[PDB]
Paper text:
A protein involved in resistance against different pathogen groups, which is only present in monocot plants, is referred to as monocot chimeric jacalin (MCJ).
Two of these sheets are canonical Greek key motifs, whereas in the third case the very N- and C-terminal segments of the protein join to form the outer and inner pair of strands, respectively. The two dimeric assemblies of OsJAC1-JRL superpose with a root-mean-square (RMS) distance of 0.87 Å for Cα atoms and 1.24 Å for all non-hydrogen atoms (using residue range 160–306 in all subunits). The dimer itself features C2 symmetry with constituent chains being more similar in crystal form 1 of the OsJAC1-JRL domain (Cα RMS distance 0.58 Å) than in JRL-cf2 (Cα RMS distance 1.13 Å). As indicated by PISA analysis, the extensive interface involving both hydrophobic and polar interactions buries more than 800 Å2 of solvent-accessible surface area on either protomer and is classified as stable in solution.
Residue numbers in the entry:
A (entry chain B): 159 to 306
B (entry chain A): 160 to 306
């Protein structure tokens, strides 16, 4: 109860984009809405915080792409985020992303081009939120991790 | 007693013998690395939550030149990064790099192949490692302790 969250990343552009983050420490990831096309245009997500209050973060990114909304049931948790990043329209962007839970694999979204990244959380720990930098695309993405 | 966070590994899909620690690390005290073309071996000493010292490793083989990194008072490991790629028939960690809050040690090895990185934010610290090894380190992951 009230174990501090771990913040890891980001991966992607070292210095491009507007900082994006959540204000209340996250405890449970409820949904992700991802817009994607050739690259990863935007991410939004809902999460429950340290006080049991739900928030929508985002969208972080631009208005392009087609949406997919992913809702996690109470027994589903995110155990790895992976993807690629590279040059797109003159910036380094997240070109593809994947979400691997204890139940399923969602993705790839985008195009698998450029440099890989991966953040596998072990020991049944969950990825419970995100942070990063964005413009018209996601330039860099990191994760919040909460053990059990 | 909040569990440590365990992230990774990066590198070889499945080659090598699983290597891990058995106590929850609180503070990383030293790293001993052997390196040449690739990262031959890693060992480290850490403090557990009762404050006693544990040695892990070495994990890896007999090659490379040694370096011993002793963390100073108030020095902690903020990011591990490196590369992995084919070497002598397997996928190995080809280079590694230790970014502390005071200085960077590395790169050790050859910066060739596929990059990996694990930055810890908000002054959290990388306090240990795990992975798979044989003659070299095949895959490596980290333990992270938030402040």
């Amino acid at each position: 109860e009230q174990c501090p969250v771990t913040k890891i990343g980001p991966w992607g552009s070292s210095h491009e984009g507007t900082v994006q983050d959540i204000t209340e420490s996250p405890k449970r990831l409820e949904s992700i809405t991802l817009y994607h096309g050739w690259s990863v245009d935007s991410i939004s997500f809902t999460y429950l915080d340290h006080a049991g209050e739900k928030h929508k973060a985002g969208p972080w990114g631009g208005p392009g792409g087609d949406p997919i909304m992913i809702e996690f049931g109470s027994s589903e948790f995110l155990k790895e985020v992976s993807g690629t990043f590279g040059p797109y329209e003159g910036s380094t962007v997240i070109t593809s992303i994947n979400f691997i839970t204890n139940k399923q694999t969602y993705g790839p979204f985008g195009r698998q081009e450029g440099t890989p990244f991966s953040v596998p959380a072990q020991n049944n720990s969950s990825i419970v939120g995100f942070f990063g930098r964005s413009g018209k695309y996601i330039n860099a993405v990191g994760v919040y991790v909460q053990p059990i």
